[PDB]
Amino acid sequence: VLYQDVNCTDVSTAIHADQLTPAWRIYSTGNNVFQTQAGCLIGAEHVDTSYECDIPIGAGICASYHTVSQKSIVAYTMSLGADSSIAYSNNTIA
């Protein structure tokens, strides 16, 4: 799930106290990832790695479906691009 704009401190309380309106019967909460363009990423792990943006969430954070250890949804820094090794030289021609 991805709440539009929340603090990830009141949503958890409303879920644990049955105060949220879209309260599903088989819904739970295992982890919260508070960041810009919030939503707490309930059901996804915030991995410190970087992969190509598959599902654009917002604020530089995206989501995909990779294998942590198994297949699950993660969150990365959008991997803005692959690194290069092009160095300037005044006597090198390619």
Partner: protein, 437 residues
């Protein structure tokens, strides 16, 4: 024919993105009243359509921003020298010692248009902040108007701009065709001149002068962006239009559309439900009309911003990723170079244009008949003549002698009008005369 050159640099501000707004019609109209929501549900799924339209606008803005900025495959590292062939590339690449990861020009751009109408942020709610500072102040309002942060952060935009500048300065211009071919900057400028029409002599023999002119133009751009007025008018006008639209929506929210009061939870407390529904229906209709007008205006503005973003992406792909011979497309005169710069919800290009210099009157010669055959000029198009003396090029003086390598054979002399009788030179005859005799 011009006798000198003048390396000028022009600026062009083009918006590529707008304010990603999100208005919850369930909170804007019928904030917390249950009977109000029950009456609103009778009018149909207008709120769902408006939310879908706003989400589509946000997705279109994100896609336009990505297509404009994210155009290269690899992220080329910014060089540490920043001084290639005499051209001082400072204040363009991110400084490795400055706290911010932007350049001086990018800092000047972000410190002159980011006012965002200071004083109107209290109207709508926004979940601003950053996860790095661990503050992340998440503010909300009763009107339901929210502003979603963009996908590409300012840091990623600055990184894309730095990668573009590195791929333009270093590796020449072949980085846009899906490759990476190393080449010095002086040879790149010589090839740009050759593509324009100017020979490499003006570049190599006057490299120091061109570098000094480029540095002076960079300094003039810095001065014009430091303390001036009426700068970055496009982005400022876009922000002002967005703020005015939000303010008009907020004012239309607190409008008494022929009812007892314009504020909710005030007519449900002093009136009876059968007598209050009549007043609720008028307010609901008025707010629905106002929100529909706002959504239509937002769609029109989003289409305009998408067109501007497509134009800016085309300009970038034509001027930064290569050398376009399009007249008055990149800059004022000859393009000859292009450097993009990051800007809030827009792109500011730095077209290093080529402008001629002081001129001089000369004499023309359509053709020259040496021994009965006319000799029309080669690639060097202008036959500069004191009195039928030499043959030169167009964009520069370049005094060069007339030989058989600069002219080709043609018909007689009575076919071209205005032909001037003169003599042609050929290095073969004196060489053979010196070798034999």
């Amino acid at each position: 024919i011009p006798t000198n050159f003048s390396i000028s640099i022009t600026t062009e501000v083009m918006p590529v993105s707008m304010a990603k707004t999100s208005v919850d019609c369930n909170m804007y109209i019928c904030g917390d009243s249950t009977e109000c929501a029950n009456l609103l549900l009778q009018y149909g799924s207008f709120c769902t359509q408006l939310n879908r339209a706003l989400s589509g606008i946000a997705a279109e803005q994100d896609r336009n921003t990505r297509e404009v900025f994210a155009q290269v495959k690899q992220m080329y590292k910014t060089p540490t020298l920043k001084y290639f062939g005499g051209f001082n590339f400072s204040q363009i690449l991110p400084d490795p010692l400055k706290p911010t990861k932007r350049s001086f020009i990018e800092d000047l751009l972000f410190n002159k248009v980011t006012l965002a109408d200071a004083g109107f942020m209290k109207q709508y709610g926004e979940c601003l902040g950053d996860i790095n500072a661990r503050d992340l102040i998440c503010a909300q309002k009763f009107n339901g108007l929210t502003v979603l942060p963009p996908l590409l952060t300012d840091d990623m935009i600055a990184a894309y701009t730095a990668a573009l500048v590195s791929g333009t300065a270093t590796a020449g211009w072949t980085f846009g065709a899906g490759a990476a071919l190393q080449i010095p900057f002086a040879m790149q400028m010589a090839y740009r001149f050759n593509g324009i029409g100017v020979t490499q002599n003006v570049l190599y023999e006057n490299q120091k002068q061109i570098a000094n002119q480029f540095n002076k133009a960079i300094s003039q751009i810095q001065e014009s962006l430091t303390t001036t007025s009426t700068a970055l008018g496009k982005l400022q006008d876009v922000v002002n239009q967005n703020a005015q639209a939000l303010n008009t929506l907020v004012k239309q929210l607190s409008s008494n559309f022929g009812a007892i009061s314009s504020v909710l939870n005030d007519i449900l407390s002093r009136l009876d439900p059968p007598e209050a529904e009549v007043q609720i229906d008028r307010l609901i209709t008025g707010r629905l009309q106002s929100l529909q007008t706002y959504v239509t205006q937002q769609l029109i503005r989003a289409a305009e911003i998408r067109a501007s973003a497509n134009l800016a992406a085309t300009k970038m792909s034509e001027c930064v990723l290569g050398q376009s011979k399009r007249v008055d497309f990149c800059g004022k005169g000859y393009h000859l170079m292009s450097f993009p710069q990051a800007a809030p919800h827009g792109v500011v290009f730095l077209h290093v244009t080529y402008v001629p210099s002081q001129e001089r009157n000369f004499t023309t010669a359509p053709a020259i008949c040496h021994e009965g055959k006319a000799y029309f000029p080669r690639e060097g198009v202008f036959v500069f003549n004191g009195t039928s003396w030499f043959i030169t090029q167009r964009n520069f003086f370049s005094p060069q002698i007339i030989t058989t390598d600069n002219t080709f054979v043609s018909g007689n002399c009575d076919v071209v009008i205005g032909i001037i009788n003169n003599t042609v030179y050929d290095p073969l005859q004196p060489e053979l005369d010196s070798f034999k005799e």
